[PDB]
Every structure is written in structure tokens, then in C-alpha cells.
Design a protein around this motif. Structure first.
Motif, short mmCIF file in Angstrom:
data_model
loop_
_atom_site.label_atom_id
_atom_site.label_comp_id
_atom_site.label_asym_id
_atom_site.label_seq_id
_atom_site.Cartn_x
_atom_site.Cartn_y
_atom_site.Cartn_z
N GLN A 9 92.08 59.53 36.04
CA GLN A 9 92.41 60.29 34.80
C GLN A 9 92.40 61.79 35.07
OE1 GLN A 9 90.58 60.00 30.43
NE2 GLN A 9 89.79 61.60 31.69
N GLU A 10 91.44 62.28 35.79
CA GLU A 10 91.38 63.75 36.06
C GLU A 10 92.17 64.07 37.34
N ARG A 13 96.49 63.84 36.37
CA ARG A 13 97.09 65.01 35.68
C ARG A 13 96.87 66.28 36.52
NH1 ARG A 13 93.63 64.56 30.26
NH2 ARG A 13 95.70 63.64 30.20
#
Length: 17
Positions: A9-10, A13
Motif C-alpha cells: 500500500q505504501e 503509490r
């Protein structure tokens, strides 16, 4: 490992910006 699914998720992006 299961740590990638979380950092994804981090890490997904952030890869753009």
C-alpha cells in the motif's frame, strides 16, 4: 513475505510520487 502485502500500500503509490 507477509510484510510486502503491508508495505505494498505504501510502496505501490510511493513508487509513483
Amino acid at each position: 513475505g507477509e510484510e510486502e502485502l503491508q508495505e505494498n500500500q505504501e510502496l505501490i503509490r510511493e513508487k509513483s510520487n
